[PDB]
Symmetry: D2
Subunit: 329 residues, 4 copies
């Protein structure tokens, strides 16, 4: 008979660690059919088979397939999560790992992906993961031409997740009940909002007064959060983090697909917020069936605005750089 209820379809443009991991989450939760795309042939087919096998093991039913062309991968995609790109620059020490160094390597790739999205699934919801995150979201937006509410970058939910895990451990509570947020550009200038930490809505200041945690401790946690990415890179030796990044991107995708209207900080288009225009940066936002339904503007104090400004300078510098060096075509 005629198909009335079509499963959601999520296209993983880039089938590396994060791409495969996100595909895993979709199969495990029967969230949507999955398509794995990558310039590397063979590997996506291997992961697609492995993942298809998972559905039987966990008693779920979604189709996991590798697609070789942009057309086959992107057509019909309800959401496109882009992880295509390099994680580390060849020959550079792990101690010098920087997301900004990936700019000259990933700009072209992201732009091309965006051009194909415009061509095959202009009505999709785009979740960019590729670094330098905030810069790549803007490139993707320009290239894909999708409405600004239909594109965002995953980063701050990951950064906040780290922030929350550390706070949760310090307070001996589930991270579910720790509301800790990191805003700004995903990089060395990200801004963990220590002043805004709450335990189920209760100000962190109360736990300082109670003698459970110290201000010093919280700032060390903020610092740890800022450098958590490099910490993992150095520990792993090869590649970078993927389990939390994948879980974060899928949580965002799920909030869109199920119109959950979850409040998740992510790289979103600024049209006046915090004083920013025509650019993307990590901010608290509401993700619903209409994409980014709201950008939350927090009341920042002097020091926070100073930190945020440095975060802004980081991404703005990268945005002018990319524009200056961009090929006409």
């Amino acid at each position: 008979p005629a198909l009335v209820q079509r499963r959601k379809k999520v296209a993983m443009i880039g089938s590396g660690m994060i791409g495969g991991t996100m595909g895993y989450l979709c199969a495990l939760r029967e969230l949507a059919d999955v398509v794995l795309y990558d310039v590397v042939k063979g590997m996506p087919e291997g992961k697609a088979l492995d993942l298809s096998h998972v559905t039987s093991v966990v008693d779920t039913n979604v189709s996991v397939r590798a697609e070789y062309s942009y057309e086959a991968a992107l057509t019909g995609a309800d959401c496109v999560i882009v992880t295509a790109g390099l994680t580390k620059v060849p020959g550079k020490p792990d101690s010098e790992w920087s997301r900004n160094d990936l700019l000259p390597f990933n700009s072209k790739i992201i732009r091309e992906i965006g051009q194909n999205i415009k061509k095959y699934c202009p009505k999709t919801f785009i979740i960019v993961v590729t670094n330098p995150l905030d810069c790549m979201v803007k490139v993707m937006c320009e290239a894909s031409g999708v409405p600004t509410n239909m594109i965002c970058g995953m980063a701050c939910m990951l950064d906040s997740g780290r922030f929350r895990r550390y706070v949760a451990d310090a307070l001996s509570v589930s991270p579910r009940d720790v509301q800790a947020t990191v805003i700004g550009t995903h990089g060395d200038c990200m801004v963990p909002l220590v002043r805004y930490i709450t335990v189920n809505g209760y100000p962190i200041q109360k736990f300082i007064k109670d003698g459970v945690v110290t201000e010093k401790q919280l700032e060390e946690i903020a610092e740890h959060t800022k450098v958590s990415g490099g910490e993992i890179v150095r520990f792993l030796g090869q590649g970078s983090a993927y389990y939390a990044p994948a879980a974060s991107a899928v949580a965002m995708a799920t909030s869109f697909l199920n119109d959950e209207k979850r409040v998740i900080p992510c790289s979103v288009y600024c049209n006046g917020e915090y004083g920013l225009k025509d650019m993307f940066i990590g901010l608290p936002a509401v993700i619903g069936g209409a994409g980014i339904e709201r950008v939350i503007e927090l009341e920042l104090n002097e020091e926070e605005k100073k930190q945020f400004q440095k975060s802004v300078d980081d991404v703005m510098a990268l945005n002018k750089a990319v524009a200056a060096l961009q090929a006409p075509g």
Copy 2:
């Protein structure tokens, strides 16, 4: 084959609406084996059968059984959730529904149950649901003799859930990301903490300034929260709320069984907080594998202190009343 990993066991003392609903959640999530106990003959066996059938439907495997003796029901229970008692006073108009009026009807029941827990499962974690909640938790504590960290009353998670749902609707966000809390005695004097409302940790104040919600609107939400129980009582015509109450109690039991350390407001033992002693009252707490592992003493503003004092007078009056009834 010697058993190494024994499933958790949850005894539902009271197999009415809430008891059966909690058994449902256990079966649906394969959380633990379930024992349905009740004074009523037959009904528990019916619900136990129905629930056991659920395991096949949803592909889980837990044992749901009815037990009519305190010994069979309580022995080996990792957690005991008590809902036994009346929901409404006979002949009392729905418009006059008051949890406090249930005192003389449920006080002896709770005491008896506590005495049996003391006898059959003194190491269990007790979650009281029966009203008047905060007063009954103390009665249960006195009768069961369990350590103060191993007994609490489900109430404020329900009140907070309502508070959160209303706020969630007003802001158009998932209630998962609304942290709203109600503390104090579960009744007309419960205390919704409007001031502490956060949206994923972001102060509700900025949302007010942004025009998403008004202060009047929030106060209305707080009032709606306080009278949500009666609202449902009147809509249903018979009995009272059970879906949210059941989910709240199981969420608490789950945080204990899996040592999650969730921050959940509930009726906990006061060891001096706010100057309160030898009583139970709704406060934010941390539920873990060691039971109540933390009780949060939030700073209250003038209005909150006034409202909290009234909440305290309410439960203290109840406790005085039960003491005189024993």
Copy 3:
């Protein structure tokens, strides 16, 4: 701002025990927005509020609303689950409880609901629960006018669920791994297929031969399966089963909404299978995004056919009777 991913909507026509319970499952699993409808004023609103509160407790976000008009309740409904109707004949002792006795009390109600679906949501997938099940499914089909693949009745999954739980207990295995099926009409003539019982595909016969279970034990399990409904009715005192019935109906709706293609025995339209035409009866079927995508025809032996023919005669007799007494409007 424009909505791209709209949540699925399930309408509970009948907000009694099963209706409310199904709404609970939807809110608990964030499966879809829920609408509770019932001729009884007040109660549906109390339950909708209770259920809306659950979403907060379990951290999900679906809308649960009571609607008192057929239009508000049915419009936009991706799936409609009908439980509206009587559970027991007033005055009749529990020892004589019979689903067929409910025919004169529920036939008109089901027809009316069908007429409303035809008007407000002709593209919906209808799941009938109201007894007498198989006859009500036909009345609903004739009244709603939906394609035969877009309507079925929940019953056999419940009967099979009981069958499975009893076998699982006898074998000391999870019922997930017990494939036991009951076919035919949901009533005293239902047919528990003992010969077809399998433990993860392994035939029950081997377990008898190896002395794990006896022939009498399985017979008692089949009998118990047949009378389970009356058993619960007599135990409860008031009303009938609702926890497993609700979970069964929702499992069916979920297979449809998520195009899972689960194989679930339910009351489906027969177009030649088992030699039956223009009628609904409990049979194994595949529920997917296109509704009933396949009706499985099992090879029945002599005794099974004899039992099945009895269930067929039961529903055929009721079908002729209901049609003869049907009010033209």
Copy 4:
């Protein structure tokens, strides 16, 4: 104060692709605290951090830690899943990938792990993943000394899952409703039981007559099932499958931890089944809180017996070789 409900603990001995992936499943489902152990220093701490971050993202609370020593990794482990070892022989072409060739490379590693399990967590449930599986499970059994019912090898649930996925696609149904089983030795001689294929208990035979699938197609599916591991190895270029293997091992661990009593084909200790003794081989089993609670000995036809004998010869040769090596 005192902990009454302790979370389960699963130790991942080997933190490579599969070890990390199983840790992911535990964190995602809040199944148990996780310990990641590996000979490679640094990497496990990296994955542990990454996984701990996941708990915040998905709102769960389990501890994920890397442990340098066997003592810290094994002590208190309710279940130990072993994936330590090589995936392919250095320098060997992908077209020549064979699990049996890994024998000399992993046998010593498995034995050492077993001795440490005996020392630090003798009461744990051991799930071996390391190839050559069936041989390695026996090595693990002899070295660990755990009860015969407290050790098994994950493999057939994976082979069966593949078998089920292919059949599910051919029939257009959810694999949840396809019961397809592969028994024997995890390798080129594994035995997909085509004759036992059922669709929710309905014989595949009828589906063949109905023309949904042909006998020749089912045989092609059986062959594909047998060579699925190599197919993935060749596609990936480096390493081998890990998503389904991880999910299979954890499904098994969960059936044990929650005493689900699921029927999962796995490498189990033989006490005469098929005339097999003192060895492990893939057979249908029941995994509950008491470990392997039942081994199902299916009736096989002539062809299946022939294929099964080859499967037996395969592992017997391996065990014979192992005994000669160490």
